[PDB]
């Protein structure tokens, strides 16, 4: 790679993984009522570590309580997951922005 | 040589800008695979690379003129 | 820098002038003496009457010298540039 | 391991970009070259007969050529391990500066080095190589300044000889009271162009640099 | 082959203009003309009587006139394919600079390119066209200096003859303390205006420079 | 000496920035122990250090240019 | 033939003002006068006695006055129509230089235009007025130099004769040492200021220039 | 021809700027078929063309001054 991308590759990959994870969370929110559905999620830490070496596998979420229709997407746990995922996405966004602003300010 | 190094650096900067521009074009055409969180990062990378290039050019040209105006 | 090399070069540098000027100045002396002989034995003279043949004398001397007068100048200067990597010391 | 972050590395690079062309070029290779050029300009009996811009350009081209082996050395020893981020700037700078330090040490005067060391009050050195660049630089500058004038006097000699001989031959025949300077200029220029002083002098100074 | 982006294109276009006063004019076009004019002003016995501004303007006009073929060739071969964006400027630059090198080859000394190549320690380059641009320029400048000095000496010779004749006759007339400089100068100026030295001198210089 | 002081200052600035970056990376990796009240503070302090460094650089280069451009 | 925007119009106006010392003064108006003033100081035998600060200032007064009909003609036919905005901004420049071009032809030699026309390869064609500006300006400079020397050596001879004759009586009277310059200088200026050659000089420039 | 090329470039930039001003005038009194983004883009392009022109003019006049203010 290059000296510039070497610094920001980690943050870019973190942002991309956050976007994909939020997409999966939105998908299993939208499919909350389809019977026979299984909630899916990404092992964020392991996937990030694997990516920062060189698609993404899906891990089924353990059902909270059983239901007759076969649907296994919870609501409260996934809502907390979505909220915290958005919060950490914004954290990564502002960290990358601060790094880029510092790099630009050094060159003035 | 210095001329070759400068030519290589200019080619690299132009390549980075072209890659960012074509990625933005693919995103705006509606082609799937872009999440808007990488096009902005690539554009910022191209902009900071161009800023470094123009800073180096300013320093070099100022040095050249001040060393040519000597006696 | 060795002080001896400063004067030793000067000794040969000055000899170049004696190598070049002597063919011209000695003839100037020889021509002038002949004029002075004409300034006796019906010694009529206005002021000098010596400048007129000296110009002709030096005119002949320069032509006769010609190449080997130039050769000394060309060779000595090239030697100085040739020895420049070794004059530094 | 330890190294410097990208921001501080680029800050250092931009800062060094200010010194590098001005002083790291002015007081390292071609100061004596431009001194010799100015001395030749004065010796030609004419102010600024060769233009200053042309003289500076020729000196810059000449020093670029001269420093070519050291340029290749520092390139292959620093940039290649650094252009592929296989070494950090902290020691890359020292590794790159080492060959230039060796060149300065080779082109130095022992008396000047000893005087500067005594002035700096540091005499623990066991070998010439272990000297610091802080004490190496001024001695190198002084030695280059000395050799500049040493060459310049030799440049002066032939025109002085021509002027003396033409003045003597001119005033020996009763023309004492007329300046021979206007008459010596064509002869000096003819001699210089006939001997090809420029091309010969460039090779001579290159050989002087190669010692 | 790809093309550079507009930003870097305009960046290099603006940057080249800073080198323009030197690279295009001083070491390429009219160094011989300006040196010859300066030497002529020196030979006339009254520097600064032809003002430097007027002399430089005349030199600029002369070099603009004498560069007519190469200027037209580079203009067509660069602008015409570049005006409607059919080839990249990065290759158009070299394709337009090649005829400039061809012109430089004729005017430069054939015996100094080899010396500069040996100084640069480049490998044996077969053919007279594949010479790199980094070597041609200094050799061309040195050849320009040599031919300018030669022309200056040739122009000097008649004025030296006039001064010697006038001084000899005035001293033989019966007066020796008369300053010949103030006496020969009006005669030199009258001879020059009778011969119309400006027009023929410019024509001869243009012919020698063009061939 | 001046070179030693400059090296020490630059090295400590780089160490502070590297520590802040590694703490932020540990936080975003999910490892417990970071409360978001330390990473932001350390990043702000690192930015302050970088601002001080660049201001010192500007002042130093301005002074050097002023003292070097004097007509002697 | 349309007009321009305000921003572009002021951009070229200030840029045209930059050329004022060169493009309009030193090659159109008084390039002959300065040479005459410089040579006159040399002819007076008192070098650098009249300061060049006032001589240059004195010259601009005379050339502005002798150029009054030309500039007044420009004022009437360009400034007044421009204040009416019935003439294009570019049209005024074209229609102002054209009468000046006829003026330049008046003060140009008979056999100097043909040199540059053949040099520029424009071809003879027809029409003495239908001449490009590229040929007029260098030819004007060359012609101005020729007439400057022609009017120059006219004044040198009377002063040189006085120097020669005063030296002749020295040898007849026994003054054979003999300092010619010191004794002759007071007599040179007394005749110069008793006849008041300046009024003759200023009058000569007015009629000779207009022809 | 340098003069011809200079005149061509100057008239081209002046004409583009005038066209942009005409577009802004047409939009400012509520004429139909004019887009705000289009008029802003035209204004910005005219401004950047003017900036390029003034920059090249300054560089060229500086180069001319440098070449004509030397010693012969």
From Swiss-Prot, chain A:
GO terms for biological process: bacterial-type flagellum-dependent cell motility. GO terms for cellular component: bacterial-type flagellum basal body, rod. PROSITE patterns: FLAGELLA_BB_ROD. It is found in: Bacterial flagellum basal body. Disruption phenotype: Defects in flagellar assembly process. Coiled coil: none annotated. Keywords: Bacterial flagellum. NCBIfam families: FlgB. The basal body constitutes a major portion of the flagellar organelle and consists of a number of rings mounted on a central rod. In Gram-negative bacteria, at least four rings, L, P, S and M are present, whereas Gram-positive bacteria lack the L and P rings. The rod consists of about 26 subunits of FlgG in the distal portion, and FlgB, FlgC and FlgF build up the proximal portion of the rod with about 6 subunits each. Belongs to the flagella basal body rod proteins family. Structural component of flagellum, the bacterial motility apparatus. Part of the rod structure of flagellar basal body. This is Flagellar basal body rod protein FlgB. It comes from Salmonella typhimurium (strain LT2 / SGSC1412 / ATCC 700720). The lineage of its organism: Bacteria, Pseudomonadati, Pseudomonadota, Gammaproteobacteria, Enterobacterales.
Curated annotation (Swiss-Prot), chain B:
One of its GO terms (molecular function) is structural molecule activity. The keyword Signal does not apply. GO terms for biological process: bacterial-type flagellum assembly; bacterial-type flagellum-dependent cell motility. Keywords: Bacterial flagellum. Its main location: other. It is found in: Bacterial flagellum basal body. One of its GO terms (cellular component) is bacterial-type flagellum basal body. Belongs to the FliE family. This is Flagellar hook-basal body complex protein FliE.
Swiss-Prot record, chain C:
Pfam families: Bac_export_3. The chain crosses the membrane at residues 18-38, 55-75. GO terms for biological process: bacterial-type flagellum assembly; protein secretion. InterPro entries: Bac_export_3, FliQ. It is a multi-pass membrane protein. One of its GO terms (cellular component) is bacterial-type flagellum basal body. It is found in: Cell inner membrane; Bacterial flagellum basal body. Keywords: Bacterial flagellum, Cell inner membrane, Cell membrane, Membrane, Transmembrane, Transmembrane helix. The keyword rRNA-binding does not apply. It comes from the Bacteria. Its main location: membrane. PANTHER family: FLAGELLAR BIOSYNTHETIC PROTEIN FLIQ. Belongs to the FliQ/MopD/SpaQ family. Required for the assembly of the rivet at the earliest stage of flagellar biosynthesis. This is Flagellar biosynthetic protein FliQ. It comes from Salmonella typhimurium (strain LT2 / SGSC1412 / ATCC 700720). The gene is fliQ.
Curated annotation (Swiss-Prot), chains D, E, G:
The keyword Membrane applies. Keywords: Bacterial flagellum, Bacterial flagellum biogenesis, Bacterial flagellum protein export, Cell inner membrane, Cell membrane, Membrane, Protein transport, Signal, Transmembrane, Transmembrane helix, Transport. GO terms for biological process: bacterial-type flagellum assembly; bacterial-type flagellum-dependent swarming motility; protein secretion. InterPro entries: FliP, T3SS_IM_P. The keyword Protein transport applies. It comes from the Bacteria. This is Flagellar biosynthetic protein FliP. It comes from Salmonella typhimurium (strain LT2 / SGSC1412 / ATCC 700720). The gene is fliP.
């Amino acid at each position: 790679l290059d000296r510039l991308d070497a610094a920001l590759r980690f943050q870019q990959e973190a942002l991309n993984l956050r976007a994909q994870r939020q997409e999966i969370l939105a998908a299993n929110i939208a499919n909350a009522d389809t019977p026979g559905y299984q909630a899916r999620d990404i092992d964020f830490a392991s996937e990030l570590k694997k990516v920062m070496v060189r698609a993404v596998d899906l891990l089924y979420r353990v059902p909270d309580q059983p239901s007759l229709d076969g649907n296994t997407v919870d609501m409260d746990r996934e809502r907390t997951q979505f909220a915290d995922n958005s919060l950490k996405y914004q954290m990564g966004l502002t960290v990358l922005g601060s790094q880029l602003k510092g790099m630009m300010n050094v060159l003035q | 040589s210095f001329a070759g190094q400068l030519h290589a650096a200019l080619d690299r900067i132009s390549d980075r800008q072209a890659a960012a521009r074509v990625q933005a074009e693919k995103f705006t055409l509606g082609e799937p695979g872009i999440a808007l969180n990488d096009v902005m990062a690539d554009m910022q990378k191209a902009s900071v690379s161009m800023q470094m290039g123009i800073q180096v050019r300013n320093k070099l040209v100022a040095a050249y003129q001040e060393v040519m105006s000597m006696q | 820098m060795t002080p001896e090399s400063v004067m030793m070069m000067g000794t040969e540098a000055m000899k170049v002038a004696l190598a070049l000027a002597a063919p011209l100045l000695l003839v100037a002396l020889i021509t002038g003496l002949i004029i002075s002989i004409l300034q006796a034995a019906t010694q009529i003279n206005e002021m000098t009457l010596s400048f007129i043949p000296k110009i002709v004398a030096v005119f002949i001397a320069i032509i006769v010298a010609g190449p080997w007068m130039l050769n000394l100048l060309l060779d000595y200067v090239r030697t100085l540039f040739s020895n420049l990597p070794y004059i530094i010391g | 391991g330890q190294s410097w972050s990208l921001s501080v590395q680029t800050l250092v690079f931009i800062t060094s970009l200010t010194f590098l062309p001005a002083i790291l070029l002015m007081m390292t290779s071609f100061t004596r070259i431009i001194i010799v050029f100015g001395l030749l300009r004065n010796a030609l009996g004419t102010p600024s007969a060769p233009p200053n811009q042309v003289l500076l350009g020729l000196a810059l081209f000449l020093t670029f050529f001269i420093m070519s082996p050291v340029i290749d050395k520092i390139y292959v020893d620093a940039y290649q391990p650094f252009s592929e981020q296989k070494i950090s700037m902290q020691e890359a700078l020292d590794k790159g500066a080492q060959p230039l330090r060796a060149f300065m040490l080779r082109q130095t005067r022992e008396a000047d080095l000893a005087l500067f060391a005594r002035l700096a009050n540091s005499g623990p050195l066991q070998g010439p190589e272990a000297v610091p660049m802080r004490i190496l630089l001024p001695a190198y500058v002084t030695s280059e300044l000395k050799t500049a004038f040493q060459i310049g006097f030799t440049i002066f000699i032939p025109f002085l000889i021509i002027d003396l001989v033409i003045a003597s031959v001119l005033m020996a025949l009763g023309m004492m009271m007329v300046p021979p300077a206007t008459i010596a200029l064509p002869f000096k220029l003819m001699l210089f162009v006939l001997v090809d002083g420029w091309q010969l002098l460039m090779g001579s100074l290159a050989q002087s640099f190669y010692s």
